[PDB]
Every structure is written in C-alpha cells, then in structure tokens.
Design a protein around this ligand. Structure first.
Ligand SMILES: CCCCCCCC/C=C\CCCCCCCC(=O)O[C@@H](COC(=O)CCCCCCCCCCCCCCC)COP(=O)([O-])OCC[N+](C)(C)C
Ligand SMILES: CCCCCCCC/C=C\CCCCCCCC(=O)O[C@@H](COC(=O)CCCCCCCCCCCCCCC)COP(=O)([O-])OCC[N+](C)(C)C
Ligand SMILES: CC(C)CCC[C@@H](C)[C@H]1CC[C@H]2[C@@H]3CC=C4C[C@@H](O)CC[C@]4(C)[C@H]3CC[C@]12C
Lengths: 953, 953
C-alpha cells in the first residue's frame, strides 16, 4: 500500500511540477474565495458563551432560574484598605473594651460617604437613546422595583447603617448607664448594628434606624471584611456593592448598564488617583473581566506577526546550502520560505473564513492562537519535502519535473500520515464541552487539512518554479538579475549531515551512551508516572487576565478579605404543595415543624464549613412567613369601612382593623390552604416597618414565583458559600452543595402530593464555569485513548509498517504523553479543556518525531542493527531535528511574550514542554530502542521501491 | 495556447486513467457530501414569490398598499350558465317590453339560493386549532369587521337583492298603474335594482331593500355577466363571489382560510356532480392556481425518469461497435452509458444540494426541468470523448493509460469550451427579474460546472476501468464471466463513418447541393428575420395549468362572460393636505370644485375603454363625503342632553339633535380644517340607512388610512379594468393606468402644500406579474448580446482559432438564434423569462454544433477546400450528429408528454426547435460555408500538435 501511495503522489507531483503557474492560480482562487469570509466574523466576549456547554446541567439550572426568578443581578464592588493607619482602643460601655482597626476612623468613612454619594448622582450621555442614563433607570431595587429613585438602589456599604447621612455619622449624645455618663458615638450604633442587622431602633440612648436607606437589613459580611468571628471592630476592609439590574443580551438597558459600568470605572480610577497615602482602593465592574480578557488580543497580536517572520527567516536560511560565499545570493531559498509562510497563512485564513461563513461565533482569544499551532504543525511537511528533494541524486537524463515528482513520491506517505494524525487528533479534541476549545479544535483541524491540500499542489508548483530559477542561475528572490559571469558549479556534501555523521551517531549509538540514555529515559518515565498523581485540576481565575490588570489586585483582595463568597440559591422546582400542612412542616425550622427539615439541614450543614462549603444558613421565607402570621400586630383585617374583606397594612393604627390576622393561637401557626393563598401575596409585599420588623418584601419579594391563580411555581433559598479562593474550592463547593440538595430532595419526595420530578438544586452564579472539573479526568483520559488508537491504526497502514515497529511507535507516543503530564503537574500548569486540547495536539504532533525515524529504520539493509540505527539517525534524524524541532521552537519561544497569563501558561509552556520531550525521545530514546529491539532487515521493502520509480516515470 | 491545454489535459488524463478506483472514490465522496443536502429543500408554491422581483416597482407599490390599506381580499367565484334553457319574454309595465334569458328562471335562482345558504353554514375541522373553523372567523366583512356573523360576510350574488330570503323571491303583489293592474314579480325588483343599485326602497308597489344583506350595494357587474350595455334581462351568467379576509404568510388564519377553500372546492364539486342538465358550473378558489401548478410535478415526474433511460439505452447501444454477432455481449458499452447517466445525475443532485444548503427556496417546477437540460448538455461531452478515444490508433508499445490520456488531450479543449460557453450563458441568463428563472439558471449553471469537473476525473477513471475490462475480453456489464474460448479479434472501420464517407459528404459537398443549401439557408434566415416582427410578448394564464384542469373552463368563462376585469386602486401616497380647500377641489368631481380634477379625469378616461383600460369610473370618497355634509338630515349634532359636543347618528329621530351638521348653505359645501377633521371619522363609520343612503362605511370604511391625530396618511380610489383576456391586454392595461396616474400627479403636484414626493399609482392585484412585459424586449436583447460576446471571445481563445473562423462561428450562432426566434413567433410560442432562459441556453448549446466542425476544418491539410470540408464533415460531423443531436432529441421527444402546457410549450417545443436548427446549420450550412469562404491550410496547427504528444507521454 505504501509503495502505491509512493507511485500515486509521484505521478501527481510529476504532473503539478510540469504545470506550476496554472496550478498556483487554480489553488490561490479557492483560498482567496474562502479567506474573503473573514469580514463575516461575529466575535463573542461574554464568559457565559465561551466557557459553558449550553446542553449541560448547570446551564439548564441557570435557564430554569432565569425563567422563574429573573437573571442574577450585576455586582460592582470597591474593596478599601488603610494599611498606613494604626489601630486604636475605644470602650463601648454597653459591650465592653474593643479594639477598632485604623480603617474605622471618622474622616475615612466621611471620604467613603462623599465617594458613594457622588457615585449615586453619576450619569452618562448614552448616545444610543440620546438621554442621560441615570442610576435609578438600571440600579437593582429590592424594595419598590417600580418608580425607583436614587434613594431606592441596592448600594450596600458600612454607611447604610446611617442611611448616608453626614449628621447621623457626626451625631453624639450623652448616655447615663449604671450611674456613670459618657459620650455615645457612631461606633456604638455600628457595634449594635453588626451583632443584629434587623433592628429599626438602636438600643443605646439613640433612635437610629439600624436598617439601610433603601430599606433592607445590610448584613455585616456585605459592609466589612477581614474580621474573624464576631470581632467586627477589628475589620481590615470596607466593601461597597453598587448592584445593578441584569437583563438578557437583546435588551438595550444592558448596553446602558455597561455604559454606567464604564463611567463607574473612570470615576473609581479618578478616586484611586486622588487618595494615595489614605486608602488602597481595589475596584472592578461586572463588565471588567469581559473587558480584560478581550483587551490583550489587540495589544500582543503584533508579537505573533513577529513569530511568523522568525519562522520565515529560519526556513529561508536553513534550506540555502551556502558553501561558496560567491553564489549565496543565487541559491539561498528566500522564495520557498516566503511561499511556505504564505501557504500556511492562506490555510489558516481559509479555515477561519469557512467557519465565519457557517455563522460559528469565534472569539478573539481563539483567532489569536489558531494560526501559531497550524503554522508550527504545517511548516514541518514543507521543510521535510525540500530536504528530501535537495538530498535526491538527479539520475542522468531525468528532467527536473520527474525529479520533483520522485522526491514528493518518496516523502508523501510520511507527510500524509503526519497531516491525517494531526487532523484526526484535533477533530477528536473538538469533543470538549467548552464552545471556545470546540471552535478552536475544529478550526485547527480544518486548517491542517487545507494546509496539506495546499502543500500537495501550490507549494510543489512553487518549488518547481524556484528549482527552474536555480537551474537558470538567477538570484535568490530577485529572479530578474539576468545571470552575471558563470558562477562556479554547486556540488557539496551537506554541513548538518556532515556534523551528525561525524559527531552525533557515533556518540549516541556508542557502547556506553545507549545503556545510559535507556536507563535515563526509563528513570524519566518513572519520575513522570509518580509526579502525574500530584496534578491540580481547574483553570482558576487570575489566569484569563494579564499580569498588569487591576482585577489581579481585586481578586487578591476578594480571596484575602471577604468573609462569605458567592451566595448560593437552593432553587425548589415546581411540584411542591407549600399550601399543605406537611408541605410547610418539611421547610420550616422553628418549634412545631418536623425535625431534619430543609432549613434545619442547611443550618446543620453550615456548622462545619470545611466539609460542607456553606458559611451561613439559608434565609427561609416560610419561617419568616409563619412568624409574620404570629398574632404580634403584623397582619390584620378591617372589621368595618368601605375597605371590607381585605388586608389592613400594619403601617396604619386606626381602631377599624384591631382584629388579628388569624383565629385563636395556643400551639403552632399552621394556616389552611385558603388562609395560605390569602395571606402569602400580602406577606411578599409587607414592607418592614418599626411596628414589627418581619415582612416578605425585604428579602423574599422576588424569592417566590406566584401564578395568577395563587400557586407557588418555584421558591429559592439564599445561602452563602465560605470564601472560595482556588478552582478546586469552587468545584468541591459545587459538589458538596449538589450532594446536600440531593440529600434534601431524598427527604422532601417522601411528603405526600410532591411530583417525583420535583428537585432542589444549589444554583450560584459561577456554576456554569466550574461544573466540568467534577468529571474532566474521565472525559480527558477517554479523549486521549480515542486519539492514541486511530493515530497508531493509520500509522501502521500508511507507512506499511509491521507490529514490531508499531508497538515501539505507540510506546514512544505514550512515554512522551506521560512525561508531558508529569512535567505539566510539576511546573505548576493545571489540567482543564485548554491543557486537554494541547495534550491531544501533542499526541497528534509527536508522530512527526517518532514515525520518520521508525520508517527510516524499517526500510534499511545494513548488516547489523547498530549500522541500521546509525544511517536511520543520520538521514531522517537530521530531517526530523532541523525541520520539526527548529520550526516548533523559534515559533514557541516568541509566545513567551504573550502578556496574557492564559496563553503565557497553557500554550508557550505546554508546547515548549511537548516540543523538547518530542525532540529528546524521537532523536535520543528511539534510535537506541531501534538499535536494541528493532525489526528484522526485510529486504523486500527497499527492493519493492524501484518497482515504483521506473514504472510511473 | 490550445496545444498547451492539449498537453495539460493529456497529462491529467494519463494520471487519472492510471489511478481509476481511488479517483472514483475521491470524486464520489464530495458529490454525495453535496447531494445529502436535498433534504434541506424548502419549496415555494405562492405565485407572488415565484414570479415577481421583490426590489421591483410593482412589488414596492404592493408593499405600500399592504402597509396602508391591509392586503387585497381573497376572491372565490362560481360562474353558472344554463345553455339548455331557452329565453322567454316578460313585460315590466314600468320599464316596458324585455327579453329575459333562460338562466333568469325562478327554480334556477332557488337552487343557487340553496347552494349559497349551504355554503354560508359550511365549517371544517381544522386539526391545527382543534376547533370547527366557521365562515364568520375568516370571511371578508366590509361593514362591522368585528363580532362578524354568517349574515355579515361579503357574499355577492344576484340574490343579495332579496337578502337571501325565499319569501322575497316568491313574493308577488298587485300594482295598479295608469288604470291597469298586473302581478309585480321579483323580475321588476331585479330590473329596478340593476339600473340603480343604491336604493333602500324599491319603486314598484314594494318596500323591498334593493341594498344587499351584509349592507353594501351589490353592483350588477358582480351579480350577472354576459350582457352588453344596460340590457341586464339578457344576462347569460350568474356569478357568486365568496370573498375572504387575506392575511400575511405567517398568520394561521390564512391556513384556516385555505382549509375553508379546500372544503368550498369539495362542496362545489358535489354541486357540479348534482346539477348536470340544469347548470354548467365553473368554479375556483384563491388557492386553486397554486394547487394546479404544484399538482402535476408529482404526476409527470416519472416521465423524466423514463427520459433518462431513453438516453442511457441510446448511449449504451450507439458506442458498442457490433461487427461480429459473437462478441456483442463482450464489447457493447453498458458500463459507460450507466456511468455517464450516474455522473450527470450526480452533478444535478450536487447542484440542487448546494443550493438547498444556501437556503435558496427552489420550487417543484424548477427541480422538475433542471436535470433534463443539464443531462442534454452534459452527455454530449462524454459521447464525443468516447468516440475520439475509440477512433485513436493505439501506437505500438503504448499502454492504455497514455492512450486514454492522449484521447482526452485531443478533445479536452473543445469539451472545456462547450462547458464554459454553457456555464457563462446560464449565469448571464440568471439576470432575469423572476426569482423562478433566476434560481433555475443559477442551478443549471452550477450543475454544468460540476458535470464538467466530474467528466474530467470520475468518467475518465470509469472509461479506464471499462477499457481494462475490454482488453481482458470480459462481458459488457457483468465483468465476472471469466472469458470463455478466445473470441475472434475485434478490428473494424466504423458503420456511421462508413455511411457518412460513402453517402453524405459527396451528396452535401456536390457541385449542385452547395449552391442549393446556401440559397435555402439564406431564404430561411430571410423568412425568419421577417416572421420575428410578428412576435407576441407575454406568458398569459391558461399556460401554467395542465390541459385537464377545471381552471381552464373557469378562465374561458371569465374571458367570455365577465363585464369588468380586476378592480384597480389609484392609491394616493402620503403628502396631500385633503383638509385644505384646493386640496378637496382637485379630487371632487361635482359642481363647485375645479375642472379636470382626479375623479373627472378618470370619469373622462372611462369614456373610451379601448384606448384607456378602465370600464367604470372611480368611486371617490371626498365626493360622497361632501355630499354627506349636504344639509339633507345625514349629519347632525345634539343641542342638549348628557351627550353634548358629539355627533348625532342619523338612525335616531329625537327632537334633541335637529341642528344640521354645518352652517348656512348657499354656494358649495367646503368644510374648514377643524370641520373636516371633526366630520371625516363620523363619515367613515356612518353605516348607510333609509334616512339618507350616503355613508362612508358602505364602500370607504377601509379606503382612507387615519392616524391618531386625525391626518389622512393615504387614500385609494376604486376603478374597474374592462375584461382583460390576453397577457398583452393585462400589460397595456397596466401601462395605460400608470400613464393616467402620472398625468393626474402632474396636475395634483400644482396644489400648494403637496410634498413633491407625493405620487398616485394604479395598484391592482395582477400588477406584480404583468409588469416585466413593459420592458422585457430591451432586457432580453441586452442579455442575448451579452451572451454572444463572451462565448465568441472564449471560442477564439480556447480553440486557438483565427478571425476568418471566429466570424463564421458568430454568424452561424446569430443565424441559429434569429431562425429560432422566427419559428418561435411562427409556431405560436410567446416571449417571456422562460423563452429568454431557453434562447440563452440555445446560444450556449449551438456552440456544440458549430465549434467542432469549424476547428476540424481549421486543423486540416488537404490540398483543396472541398477535400478539407469533406474530411472535416466526415470525422467531426459524425461526432457532432451521433453525440449532440441524438442525445438532445431522444431526451426532448419525451418532454412532449409533460401534461403541463408550460413545459409542453416552452421546453419541449423550444428545445426541439433549437436542436433541429443547430443540427441543420452545424451539419448542412457550416460545411458548405467552410468549403466556400473557409480559412487557409495553415500547416503549423497540425504540425504543432506532435510537439504535445511525444513531450508529455
Ligand atoms: C478558477 C478560475 C479560473 C481558472 C483559469 C485560470 C488559469 C489560467 C492560468 C494560466 C497561466 O498562468 O499561464 C499559463 C498558460 O499556459 C497554459 O498552460 C494554460 C493552460 C490552461 C488550463 C486551464 C484549465 C483549468 C480548468 C479546470 C478548472 C478546475 C479548477 C477547480 C479547482 C477548485 C502558463 O503555463 P505554465 O503554468 O507556466 O506551464 C509551464 C510549464 N511548461 C513549461 C512545461 C509548459
Ligand atoms: C475523501 C475521504 C477519504 C479519501 C480516501 C479514500 C481513497 C481510498 C480508495 C483506494 C482504493 O479504492 O483502492 C486502491 C488502493 O491502492 C491505492 O493506490 C491507494 C492509494 C491511496 C491514495 C489516497 C490519497 C488521497 C488523499 C488526498 C485527499 C484529497 C481529496 C480532496 C478532493 C475533494 C486501489 O488502487 P487503484 O485505484 O485500483 O489503482 C490501480 C491502478 N494500477 C493498476 C496502475 C495500480
Ligand atoms: C484558542 C483556545 C484553545 C484558547 C483560548 C480560549 C480560552 C483560554 C478562553 C476562552 C474563554 C475563556 C474563559 C471564559 C470564562 C471565564 C471567566 C471566569 O469565570 C474564569 C476565566 C474563564 C474560565 C475564561 C478563561 C479563558 C478562556 C477559557
């Protein structure tokens, strides 16, 4: 079969090289026809679309939540610190001695108040609607979501305990307790606020509204960070969350939100530049991450434009046999290098253009790196072809067309094997769940296919033209010089081949070094197989970002100073009869309701925050509901007046609704179906007041979905993950949350009248990203096995190889892969979709280093195995090294200036590591193993070749 | 250049024919990959989408009308006739002696009443909405478009003059006039109704409501047809229009309408089968035409499946050289014929599949005929190739691969020329305005390209395989017979070539016949150039239909019995101040308003119905408005009561609104801006009553678009085209209407305060179809000139031909085309987009007949011109005839059973005509002209060929 491919591609080559210009044109036309489609590119920036499989579980849960509770509100934080400020003692006289941190000075809080108040009245132009977009238009309003004002927006801060009132900060009174009198200050109100956030009146000779301005109780963990336990006076950070209403992607209000976000960042930069030795401001915006991952691609893209020139120069100076110093300017292959680069750039542009035509949304960070890998893969073929063509002895009375045809015939099977292995590998790598790596893998796959199809026609035509210029003795690139006085005739022996034959092959295949390198590579495999088990799964944040981004400082401050991470929502699906008795029993946590209920289970789970990643219990709505129906003057009905048979709001105190909400109380408040249906929508709109602080609107207004008939479709319960820092923490947190939700559903399905399709799932915002790392190891291992099988299967069909060679090939590929994974885990590179597509590309590429040497040893007729290994090493090892390794490395070493930690880590380092391991194995380990346990001589594979040379000449 | 194409395709052929199976596979893979897309076909049936350029003027006017007045209502008619009924005399005694036609008997009208009344209460199931769709849901209601009932639907008939009341039909009273008494019958009311349709009370001792049931005056021309003048008693047809509300294509109510239409047709078929010797019923539905053009494509598609077998059999029996009668079963080319048919079917399926992928909506009537033309074009190439290959003397010591390569090398330039000429021709034919012919032209173009690309690779590979089986002496199709006793060796001289060389060439190029045929073909060109001017532009209706469709009978009845054709709407664009004084003056027609106004101009135009295609004047709304504001107790205002400062409907007669609608009257009723704005919306809802028959709701409710402020955006005026029969009539009617609208705008733009963008255009329903025939002759002539230039330009580059040959080629093509157009006009084939794409395909194809003979004469070395013409005729005329003509004709002669008058006329007849004229010219006229004024010997074109045979062997 191999000899038939030899004849096939020999015939094709002999034809093409006899019609160069016509085929250059016939090959350029479809490439440009495909590359014209690059103007149809519709780029994605949203982290949700680039890094989540839309048919996954986490995305189905997100879709559900978005349907039944609206989308998760956009968070915009400002983490402050005064490290130059010393701590000071201050006695409370009601709580005792306390140590107040430097950041809790008056002046600093006054400066924060000024910053916040300025950030309220901030507007933009918004030239889309031609009206000044103001905060009340887009801001998140938990109370009064309609007719929202600048004093109704979810602006959490330490100053929401004084409703952003300068006189309430500067307020001081005289409290006489236990006979002694002292000055009660803001600090006393702050300390009374931190220990109990839901108090309408302070308990220290002050009628201060401890509840927030917008009218929901600001919890300490959203106002201060860096404390440990309940010692809130020792707080080392002041947080300020400008929450905005989120909308779907097709809503112009989201565009207006992002305009306000940009203005917020500009204002915050102005504030940071203002306060130098006072604060250490670290801020962000919901747009910031999308802005920081999609900023660099335009900044460091010229460095890749340099990467191409580094390869062009190398191919140009490495193929030009300079051995006269009088005709270097006539023979140095400039045209071939330029052609080669043009071919691979044509191939990548054709691939990207074709995938622009199908309307596949390809991000900037995908188009940034495709061309690099396709070039590094698709220059090796043209290099090996030119080397083989240059090393062929032109037979007497044979034209250049048949000579080029014959060269192509010799090194076509190996080039086809290489291209098919890499194409298959990339197209099987494309099964990753992430759309980004999927699109990337498919792009690189198609690009390698088109690159091979161009290398067969366009490049062979160009080599024919270039060789024709050589025979005419015309200059390297300028073929219009009209040759001068007859240059001395060009006959050499090769410098690279000379160097190898003199030094390397005797040194490597010496009596001593063979044993040494065999033991060394077994030791390397052993160490690697050990060090593999110390691998860290997860592409954690701070890697997508550059090294100079403010978000790095922000994420340092989050992971260091915060006290509760992302808030998790235990969303209850439809098919639960909440209006029933046993329905309310299994969700309640107080006295009267059954033991080991929903809220009680979560409250029990948050005891051990290390085992179960929940730091704070679930804020249940049924508990605050049944407490709202307690006869404590919250719910009342009118007895007379024109407003008969309706609710009496607790805000009024007239003698016309002194009737309590419900009947006699002695045991447990358990309203019947009608009572439940009539009292729930009153609860979900009972704004909290001083009369009784209980009220549904405060924190449950949007946490229950009611249909028109009065049926609770779904209901979510808010719990807080402990500070999540690593990607491991995020994944284990999701896993523990899911397990807890499953354990709760196992108990809740036992209630009579619950549809068994009813399930509770712990939805948080960062679940669509950190779900795969649950089960990326099985999927990845499966993908690498499914890439190792067909590569080997094609390898031992295309080369016409036996099994004694095939097993050595497969062993060498597996050894490279284990060594790569070992050093990947050792260096500190994590394992995820990016590392997976790189390991798949490694399985695809390493064939280049292995297959050439294995074949060059197979088709060999020297008496002893050492001489077969010697000649195989010299010829094909020279080709492999000079072509493959030094077209990978001068490309890779340029990526080391990417500025984006993502590429800087997962492309530069991995491809460097794979290249160096491929080089080492393919040139050092494989010749020695071939010298030891290589195949037999088998002369009817060098004898069977001349049947293929004189037949189709 | 030609010799370089010779070498190029020789090299390619020699390669492919040396690797047959691999290239069969490599060529079948992309064909199947493209042909898999046939499942993505989204077929159009709507005559609007298939037969109108959406960027045209008529479609812009339609879009405008659809925006500002809603879509044109769907018409469903039933034309009745009683030809077996004799006429009878009946005296009126108020109008005088009258002759009543047989169809105006009582019993017949009673049967019509029963039919109509049954057609009112008709419902369907409609399994889409699972509710019984009834008439009131979808029926067109001019009065009361909301809360519509079965007695509020636009059901015009002769029985709307008795509101579908059996007792009002059977009613008879005793009228004493001038002292004499007689029985007044329904006939008297009918005659009083016909002469004045808008009368609430009859004038013959009867209080009969002459106005219709649904409450709009039924005009005589919508109830009776076949009369001539005002002699309505001599009516020979009874019409019944079940008008339905039309909707856009995305409305399920349209689907429900079409369900009701299907049920209507079923009911009408039942009625037609019921009454045999009583009525001659001819009916339709708005869906009927869409149903009749898209029914046949599934019925007569097997006949095309037969057309392929007729060509397969011919190619199979015409290439098998049978000259032994012992080895006919070893040599007859069955595999080649089957392969050829498979290739062309692959090509057409690949083309259709590719155009299914781009989402191009391709109708059934387009996919019905593409494969035929592509096959008839793409079998000639393979036939000529096989003939040339069979006629080549295999040189001693030359393998079959080089022999097939050499054959392909010889007849590649001519095949490429043929394919490029046809591709270019079709792709320039694609510039037709119609989407149907555009899609068709593009499809055939791409199919011919892919067919040529397959003929170069797949077919040459298959010919190599077949020839290999021949050399092995294995049977025709079953190549597994393992040859028997050695068959006698196969050496012949050809039967076709023998017959030609013996009989034809001496007979044609005799001293006598050359002069005869030259004079004959000049006479043919002359007669054709005369008969061309008697051409009929327009694809008239009755051609899209089969010969057995009921719509043929319906269209006969329309063109014979109707008295006014389609109703035209003189739609007035925005930018006219109707509320002004001069505004109302230039649209009014009565006394007071200016002379030569809008309505007066249309009323003057309808005087001569032959010159201007308007049979009835425009029903103006401003005239009936200003007549409605006449103090004649139509409009009144309340003087007291709780309903102060509003209109007082004329229906009431209380003493509370005896105030007239306007001030003192002495001259002309000219309401000011405020009066106009306050009185217009009252007019457009004043339902006509007995008090005064004037009222806007009757016929102007929807003929004025009012904005919320009270500004008339647009306003349409209803006029009736005289009975339009031919396509010429439709086109001249549109042209005359447009001219009249332009003349009116030229006067209306002179009113001060009219935006000069304001224009009036005469919109009717059949304008999107019959607009092109205004200017199809310039567009068609331009397209044929732009197809003649590049064909000739490519012809005298690819063949390497001089100008003395090129001019004879161009002359022969022009002569064929003029002859085709002459016989096209003579036979009775009309000229439109279909005939245009066929004439373009003719310009493309005729190159096959001409170029081969011209070249075969060019490359010739006989001493005298007669001998050059003789040998050119014999060799290449045998190839042209046997291949081209007898692969066109056995294909075409099958289309003559299409059953669809469209294809039966415009494909069968035209392609037959073009084939026979191509045959005649290419084989009779061209050899003789080449014998007379042919080129010189020029030996360096037969001498320059062997440079191309031994070089690339
Ligand atoms: C595409 C749109 C257009 C395609 C047409 C553009 C090609 C024209 C370029 C010709 C040219 O550059 O000059 C050439 C004109 O000499 C020739 O040899 C001309 C040969 C014409 C063959 C073209 C057939 C392609 C049709 C099939 C289309 C299927 C494509 C489908 C693929 C997707 C010079 O010849 P040369 O190359 O310098 O040869 C020198 C070698 N020698 C010294 C031994 C003689
Ligand atoms: C596509 C998906 C898949 C393409 C692969 C399918 C092809 C396999 C078919 C081979 C076969 O049928 O048996 C063949 C195996 O003997 C050979 O000669 C094998 C040659 C392999 C060459 C394939 C390279 C194509 C890659 C380039 C792809 C670019 C395609 C892009 C186009 C859009 C038999 O050989 P033969 O043909 O009978 O030769 C007999 C002649 N002889 C007697 C002189 C020897
Ligand atoms: C061309 C391909 C193979 C490499 C570039 C694509 C990768 C590196 C890009 C595309 C989409 C990006 C991810 C999108 C979502 C987020 C947001 C945050 O939650 C963590 C970072 C993370 C997870 C990004 C990391 C980098 C990322 C994965």
């Amino acid at each position: 079969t191999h000899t038939l491919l030899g004849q096939f591609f020999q015939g094709w080559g002999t034809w093409v090289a006899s019609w160069p210009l016509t085929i250059l044109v016939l090959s350029v036309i479809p490439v440009v026809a495909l590359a014209a489609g690059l103007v149809f590119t519709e780029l994605t920036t949203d982290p949700v679309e680039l890094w989540s499989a839309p048919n996954s579980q986490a995305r189905s849960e997100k879709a559900f939540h978005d349907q039944h509770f609206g989308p998760f509100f956009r968070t915009n934080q400002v983490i402050l610190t005064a490290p130059n400020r010393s701590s000071y003692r201050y006695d409370s006289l009601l709580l005792g001695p306390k140590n107040f941190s430097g950041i809790l000075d008056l002046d600093l809080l006054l400066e924060l108040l000024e910053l916040q108040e300025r950030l309220r009245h901030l507007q933009v132009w918004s030239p889309e609607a031609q009206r000044n977009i103001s905060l009340q238009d887009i801001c998140y309003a938990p109370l009064n979501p309609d007719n929202t004002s600048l004093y109704d927006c979810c602006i959490n801060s330490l100053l929401q305990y004084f409703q952003n009132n300068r006189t309430l900060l500067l307020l001081t009174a005289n409290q006489t307790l236990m006979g002694q009198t002292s000055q009660v200050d803001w600090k006393d109100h702050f300390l009374y606020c931190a220990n109990a956030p839901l108090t309408f009146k302070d308990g220290t000779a002050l009628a201060l509204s401890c509840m927030a301005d917008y009218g929901a109780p600001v919890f300490p963990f959203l106002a201060i960070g860096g404390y440990k336990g309940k010692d809130y006076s020792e707080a080392e950070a002041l947080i300020m969350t400008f929450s905005l209403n989120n909308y779907p992607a097709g809503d112009p209000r989201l565009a207006q939100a992002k305009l306000w976000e940009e203005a917020f960042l500009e204002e915050m930069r102005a504030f940071q530049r203002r306060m130098a030795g006072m604060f250490q401001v670290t801020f962000m915006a919901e747009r910031s991450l999308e802005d920081e991952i999609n900023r660099t691609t335009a900044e460091d893209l010229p460095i890749f434009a340099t990467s191409y020139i580094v390869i062009f120069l190398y191919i140009s100076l490495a193929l030009g046999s300079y051995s006269s110093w009088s005709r270097v300017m006539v023979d140095s292959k400039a045209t071939l290098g330029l052609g080669g680069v043009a071919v691979v750039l044509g191939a990548v542009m054709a691939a990207m253009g074709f995938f622009s035509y199908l309307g596949i949304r390809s991000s900037l960070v995908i188009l940034q790196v495709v061309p690099f890998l396709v070039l590094s893969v698709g220059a090796d073929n043209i290099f090996i072809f030119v080397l083989e063509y240059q090393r062929l002895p032109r037979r007497p009375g044979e034209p250049r067309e048949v000579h080029i045809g014959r060269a192509l015939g010799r090194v076509a099977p190996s080039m086809l094997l290489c291209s098919l292995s890499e194409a298959i590998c990339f197209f099987l790598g494309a099964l990753t769940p992430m759309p980004a790596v999927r699109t990337f893998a498919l792009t690189s796959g198609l690009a390698v296919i088109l690159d091979f199809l161009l290398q067969m026609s366009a490049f062979v035509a160009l080599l024919s033209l270039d060789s024709k210029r050589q025979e005419a003795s015309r200059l390297d690139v300028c073929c219009c010089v009209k040759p001068q006085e007859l240059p001395p005739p060009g006959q050499g022996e090769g410098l690279l081949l000379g160097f190898f034959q003199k030094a390397y092959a005797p040194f490597l295949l010496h009596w001593i070094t063979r044993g040494v390198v065999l033991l060394l590579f077994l030791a390397l495999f052993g160490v690697s197989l050990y060090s593999m088990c110390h691998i860290s799964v997860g592409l954690d944040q701070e890697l997508a970002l550059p090294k100079d981004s403010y978000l790095l400082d922000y994420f340092l401050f989050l992971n260091r100073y915060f006290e509760v991470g992302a808030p998790v929502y235990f969303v209850t699906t439809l098919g639960y009869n909440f209006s029933s008795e046993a329905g309310m029993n299994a969700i309640c946590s107080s006295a009267g309701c059954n033991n080991f209920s929903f809220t009680q289970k979560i409250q029990y789970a948050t005891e051990f925050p290390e085992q179960s990643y929940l730091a704070i219990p679930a804020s249940s709505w049924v508990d605050d509901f049944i407490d709202w129906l307690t006869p404590s003057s919250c719910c009342r009905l009118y007895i007379s007046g024109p407003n008969k048979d309706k609710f009496c709001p607790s805000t009024v105190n007239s003698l016309n609704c002194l009737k309590n909400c419900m009947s006699i109380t002695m045991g447990s408040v358990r309203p019947s179906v009608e009572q439940f249906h009539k009292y729930l929508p009153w609860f979900l709109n009972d704004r909290p007041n001083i009369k009784c602080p209980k009220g549904g609107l405060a924190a449950y207004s949007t946490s229950v979905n009611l249909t028109s008939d009065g049926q609770v479709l779904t209901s979510r319960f808010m719990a807080y993950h402990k500070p999540l820092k690593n990607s491991q923490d995020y994944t284990e947190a999701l896993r523990a949350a899911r397990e807890l939700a499953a354990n709760i559903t196992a108990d809740l399905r036992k209630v009579p009248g619950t549809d068994p399709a009813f399930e509770v799932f712990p939805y948080t915002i960062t679940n669509v990203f950190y779900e795969q790392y649950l089960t990326i190891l099985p999927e990845g291992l499966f993908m690498l096995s499914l890439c190792l099988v067909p590569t080997f299967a094609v390898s031992c069909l295309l080369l016409g190889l036996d099994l004694r060679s095939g097993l050595l090939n497969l062993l060498s590929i597996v050894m490279i892969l284990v060594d790569t994974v070992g050093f990947m885990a050792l260096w500190g590179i994590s394992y995820n979709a990016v590392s997976l597509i790189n390991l798949v590309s490694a399985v695809g590429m390493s064939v280049e280093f292995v297959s050439h040497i294995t074949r060059s040893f197979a088709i060999s007729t020297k008496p002893t195995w050492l001489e077969r290994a010697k000649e195989a090493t010299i010829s094909m090892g020279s080709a492999v090294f000079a072509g493959v390794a030094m077209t990978n490395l001068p490309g890779i070493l340029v990526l080391g200036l990417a500025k984006a930690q993502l590429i800087q880590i997962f492309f530069f380092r991995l491809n460097l590591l794979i290249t160096l391991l491929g080089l080492l194995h393919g040139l050092v380990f494989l010749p020695v193993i071939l010298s030891y346990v290589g195949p037999d001589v088998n002369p009817a594979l060098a004898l069977e070749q001349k049947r293929a040379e004189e037949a189709v000449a």
